[PDB]
Amino acid sequence: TRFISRHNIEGIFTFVDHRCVATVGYQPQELLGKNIVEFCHPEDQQLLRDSFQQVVKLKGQVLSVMFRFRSKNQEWLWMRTSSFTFQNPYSDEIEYIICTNTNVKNS
Amino acid sequence: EFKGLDSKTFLSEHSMDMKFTYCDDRITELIGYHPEELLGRSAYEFYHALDSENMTKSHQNLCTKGQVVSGQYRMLAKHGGYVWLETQGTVIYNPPQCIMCVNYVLSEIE
Numbered sequence: 001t002r003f004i005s006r007h008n009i010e011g012i013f014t015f016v017d018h019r020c021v022a023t024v025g026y027q028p029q030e031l032l033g034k035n036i037v038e039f040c041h042p043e044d045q046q047l048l049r050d051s052f053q054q055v056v057k058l059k060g061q062v063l064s065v066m067f068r069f070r071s072k073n074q075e076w077l078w079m080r081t082s083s084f085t086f087q088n089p090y091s092d093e094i095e096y097i098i099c100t101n102t103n104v105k106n107s
Numbered sequence: 108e109f110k111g112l113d114s115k116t117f118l119s120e121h122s123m124d125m126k127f128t129y130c131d132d133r134i135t136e137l138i139g140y141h142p143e144e145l146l147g148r149s150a151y152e153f154y155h156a157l158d159s160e161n162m163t164k165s166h167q168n169l170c171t172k173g174q175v176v177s178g179q180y181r182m183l184a185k186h187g188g189y190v191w192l193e194t195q196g197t198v199i200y201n202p203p204q205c206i207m208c209v210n211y212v213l214s215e216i217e
């Protein structure tokens with residue numbers, strides 16, 4: 001029950017794996033270009049922004065965040081996004097965040 | 108004219124036994140494989156014989172450390188030959204669920 005997503009430091013979806021349709025309902029074309037914060041519960045938006053800003057400072061370590069994502073079926077799904085920044089060591093291009101997004105329980 | 112570093116970078120996902128559970132469509136332009144023909148197969152089946160022991164050590168390290176950077180290694184291409192790769196591997200645990208791989212083909216492509 002998971003999909004891979006690639007983001008810019010701002011949180012914009014720059015790559016989405018097709019398994020997102022099962023997970024949240026949207027086709028990859030409906031998420032690309034959009035920011036991940038746009039699909040987030042208003043109570044979790046700041047936390048998700050602070051996690052994206054901190055995962056940059058953590059030198060490639062994994063940082064996990066739990067938040068509510070509005071699915072295409074108009075439901076708040078509990079997501080666990082595990083993320084890390086990747087920078088190709090042969091270059092000095094800006095780092096991009098790589099995420100694993102899974103629908104988990106809050107019990 | 109050749110491909111750049113981003114164009115030669117693909118993502119792959121594996122279960123803890125090295126099996127492919129996901130691969131980015133970009134691997135077709137680089138190595139020739141199709142993500143569906145890799146699913147269920149072990150990553151180990153693709154390493155060059157001379158790079159086998161090093162990748163075993165990298166996997167053992169990855170399992171204990173949580174993240175690893177492989178050395179330069181060779182992967183068998185679809186129509187014979189071997190390309191040189193360098194991968195950054197990261198284990199996704201449940202605070203192990205899977206291994207995420209950011210793979211970069213060092214070899215000169217297109």
Ligand SMILES: CS(=O)(=O)c1sc(OC2CCCCC2)c2c1[C@H](O)C(F)(F)C2
Pocket residue numbers: 119121122123124125126150151153162165166169175176177182192194195196197206207208210
């Ligand atoms: C983190 S690593 O040791 O660099 C590493 S490279 C790799 O597979 C290659 C990825 C690119 C296409 C050919 C196969 C794998 C690992 C882990 O041991 C794994 F289990 F996830 C499987």
